[PDB]
Symmetry: D2
Subunit: 380 residues, 4 copies
């Protein structure tokens, strides 16, 4: 069973630790390492690869990601390349996928996934405890969108639809690789496409939990997440007229208690995010806001002079999400920048009205937020 | 919608509150109250019935429990009598079921259930927060048995399978009434039967959640649950050779944090439960223990002289359960006692090794226990 | 025992409840109600006074606030007026003080205070659970200042030093009335003065705890605390060169777990508090910042253009506090504004780096912060 | 500053790790290791000692404990011997004391203690988070006794009066060594004597907290604690007619949040403890119970046939404690065995009525239990 590791610019030590863990496992029959470019990180893994495939017995190869899609060359080209090598150049029946930077990795990840895949699941998906102010794309964009567009389906119930940690058996991989929509998704939008089309095609999905597991992403402003945001939203927008059957088997490993050190985590720099909400304005962005409801139009125009976000409550965000679905133009610098400020005001609003009330209150909220969105869409 | 209240020797004011609350609800068309005998509590409901019918504009009937099954005349006869009335004497699309003593009932119970059934679900079950040491039949008998016997199915994933608070649509209620296995189950076993056969027949199920739970029963030795225990185990034993499919659509409102009073609650009298373990011994029971694995035989026989329960861990209980499934005879006095004592040692073991570790541990233990039983059963 | 209720424009029913509850208490001999003006709220208490005096057998007087001090005519004048009445017009061994708006007052407040004074304590202070983001004057001004100036003493260990709920014995109340520093403190600063001088004069102190806290004030920008802030800081500034002994006996009932509603509460309007930071600037304030360390000068001057607060960590606030102690002028409009803005940046910093981590973190941060200030001050 | 390590039969690896940590510290000027006997453990430390005093620079000697007291040769002779070597054979001004088995040890222990001792404290006392069913001697014997006998004093407010982790400056050590009562306390009673006489003599006491720190003592029945119990109680009994001034300066480092893995700990084997309550009976123990109140006499006599403990509530225990103070004869096998069963019934009662309600509820209880005991004694 193949085990793929997409990397780019990560410290090669951590990666190579995870690759050793993988090759040692008695249920892993090959390891593939798909780099972004021929940098020093990649050069390091290419020299290390002959060594690990000798001590452990299992072969380990390294390849550059190919240009398979039509958007930005990113995560999507890397994962779809792994698919091409899995189907066309080997004959294994199971492929794993793990982020390279994961310092929390262990043998318990790979075993659980293979163990669940024995019950016959086409797709096993890992999911971990996340801080109340992390995962804001997941919650306010991916899950909210799935809730508002496909409330009766399993889509919005998937815990971490942007997650790169998963297993997929051969038929499932082959189906995704042949699918024109996922093939062209060469950027951050790929995880959204794997998730959406597996559910649409009736693939049965287990979700593995991981008690404690994640590499605390970097403390900066919400700016750092800007590219991922506009691409993840575009992905959902591109799927908005698709139809999805209700039936699809879906189960999820019970979540163990969130460890303290994750519940006590802050997901972003509040000051930098407020400052950034006042930057990069343009007369067209002000013109384009006329398309939104009055409180949102008025609210965000205030951000030219001072930070504003109390306006962007749960309802305001839904109303804003519908307008974005209709009018957002991927690749348009003004539309991309407005999405980023709007989403920012939502993150700030939720942070001070919800997160600030404590990690528990944040979890109950977020599950219940999806519930009301589900209900509001089913009605209309 | 019909709203049914099965009652016994209840505070008549606690019952009449819930009757008035349901009759005032705009989605409710009728209220039925079922009791076994025309005792003082019954004549009160009948004498009040005309007054509530005027004030709310909703008819309020009161009927006797009829003998429709062939086991002990109990809860099942009462619930199936309401199904009968609902199908033969009315023409409403929906029926509710609520225990009478619940002192937490507000109009929100009926509102959330009817909103859930709009989505189109055929069954809506209410689930609640419970204490680590309540729900020991639910956990160690009903769910455990579902997990051991039908691991690949939805049965062990249902939260409150013995719960009597629920909503069915006319077609679901009809199917259950016509079914000979549920008709016969006149005793405590009925909730197990409604749960099992709806899952077998591919009924779509939503699980509502009421934020403030039920009203907690009397604090006494496990002694009080003895009849419920044998009858719930018999229900499952009776279904043991049934076949059940993998598919049946199942969802559930997200649970809110347990309230303090519930997490800080002891479910039973530990002293009295220990004392009871050394009582009602017979020679025959001593010999019957020969059918069990050695640690369970030696473990329980100790209880003639002093309370023992360390031996009855999670594995030993699974092995015990399998032996009971093959040899336990509902109505054989010694078999019933041995089940009572065997389950008591599980509860005590669970209490001292799990419940005593804090409520959050208790919940996570319990969701994971079902996981392990599921897995063992699938791999054999 | 005398029981004093200082009131303003309160719901007259909320006040009269607390008056009736105290008058019915068997350990209470008189109740005094003090207000500034004979407004509608005052005439209500006077018109009801004869009726309560009959029903409970306890006299109920109502007096005007007299001008006994030389600062703003405020809380101090009212509290010292009650001390006057208590010492010159009655002969009771004890006096109570309770804010009027507290909607949580039961007879247990007076019971626990009088039981504590039996042990023989001269002061009994009530303390409560508060939210991470309430009590920002208490923490960052009163306690912080006690810790920096008198680290080897009991002052910074008192829980609710600005709290007006307390009991004194006749001898303690007499000492405070005769003291020229507390007599003069007619404004918000009075609670600081009662706290400080009782500790200086070796009064023995018990700290009662009421399990359900106060009634929480209005949700608005830090703006509302502005007068309280300057006046509380001035109180401490005014005592800065005092000497205080190491010995003064001090104990405190153990605190019970905070209730959910309190731990999940935001103390202030984060948007409005940020906006307020960019308002009411003057050139003079810009120049005054020259007295401060460079990071605080650059940090606050940013606020003319956009909200900044990361720079105002725990150390920078200590350095800021020392500069304020030497240069702050109560009544100089620009000094008061700069304190307001400086303290606002501390509160915001604290909020985003500490409070947002969960209520349990907030408490432990705060007890440890006092520890570190204490230590720095002792080692210099 | 000397740093003493009393050992006996501990694994020498852990000990020698702690001794290396100590000798490295720049504020530690010597290390003394007082063994119980000349076993293999001691022989191992004697060969290792010349090595550690070479790499680190600080000298390290090992001595056998001397016979200084009149009771069992135990902890007390070991600690008092350290005192003799500290005063008579060196000239250091500070002596530490640490349990040998502590696997959680670090540099943060020694630094904090020396740092607090700079403020001038005669006695610094470490204290750590403990499980709800550990520390049952501390709570039901030492602290309860201090509360019932000396309620107005600081004695019962000391967090861990049986703790061996502390620092004491020269004058304090010399005072204890000269004190005839502490010198003769050669057994488990010594910690009680250090605590009692330091408070009686007005020694000023800081309590260091340790966030996470303790070696989970062995999982067995309450039997394992039997010797410590009868000696710790005897110690209190021997002090019951002493007089204690109220004044004595006392402060304590704020406790950080209890880590999960300690809150999820079970302090003893419930089954073995119940069985043991039915063992070692004697006609004289039944005769001696006639001296106790009726519910306690009747309750414990039941334990001849079956385990009983619901009787032994908080009040029953106090009434029982007073009778024990008057009639308990140290060294008498029947009196010692009755104390052990009585205390056992109290532990079991608290475990199932208090601990079982969750670690938080257990902490609030135990602080409040001391409060009522304090109040009940002050009255009478
Ligand atoms: Mn990553
Ligand atoms: Mn009931
Ligand atoms: Mn107020
Ligand atoms: Mn030890």
């Amino acid at each position: 069973s193949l085990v793929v590791f997409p990397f780019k610019h990560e410290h090669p030590e951590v990666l190579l630790h995870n690759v050793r863990v993988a090759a040692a496992h008695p249920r892993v029959h090959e390891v593939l390492c798909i780099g972004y470019e021929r940098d020093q990180t990649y050069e390091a893994v290419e020299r290390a690869a002959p060594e690990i495939s000798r001590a452990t017995g299992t072969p380990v190869s390294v390849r550059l990601q190919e240009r398979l899609g039509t958007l930005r060359p990113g995560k999507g080209d890397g994962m779809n390349t792994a698919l091409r090598y899995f189907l066309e150049e080997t004959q294994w029946e199971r492929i794993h996928f793990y982020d390279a930077d994961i310092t929390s990795f262990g043998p318990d990840w790979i075993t659980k996934a293979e163990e669940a895949a024995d019950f016959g699941y086409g797709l096993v998906r890992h999911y971990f405890p996340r801080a109340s102010t992390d995962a804001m794309i997941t919650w306010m964009i991916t899950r909210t969108g799935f809730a508002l567009l496909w409330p009766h389906t399993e889509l919005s119930w998937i815990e971490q639809p942007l997650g790169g940690e998963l297993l997929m058996r051969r038929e499932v991989a082959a189906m995704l690789y042949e699918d024109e929509r996922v093939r062209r998704r060469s950027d951050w939008g790929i995880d959204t496409l794997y998730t959406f089309v597996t559910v649409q095609q009736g693939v049965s999905i287990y979700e593995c939990y991981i008690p404690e597991g994640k590499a605390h992403r970097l403390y900066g402003g919400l700016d750092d997440l800007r590219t991922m945001l506009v691409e993840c939203f575009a992905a959902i927008q591109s799927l908005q007229h698709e139809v999805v059957g209700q039936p699809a088997i879906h189960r999820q490993e019970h979540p163990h208690r969130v460890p303290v050190h994750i519940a006590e985590r802050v997901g972003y720099d509040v000051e930098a995010t407020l400052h950034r909400l006042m930057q990069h304005w343009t007369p067209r962005q002000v013109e384009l806001l006329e398309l939104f409801t009055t409180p949102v139009r008025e609210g965000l125009r205030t951000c030219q002079r001072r930070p504003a976000f109390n306006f962007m409550d749960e309802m305001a965000w839904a109303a804003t999400y519908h307008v974005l679905l209709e009018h957002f133009q991927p690749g348009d610098p003004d539309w991309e920048e407005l999405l980023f400020k709007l989403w920012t005001t939502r993150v700030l609003n939720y942070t001070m009205t919800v997160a600030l009330r404590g990690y528990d209150y944040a979890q109950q909220y977020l599950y219940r937020m999806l519930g009301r969105y589900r209900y509001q869409a089913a009605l209309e």
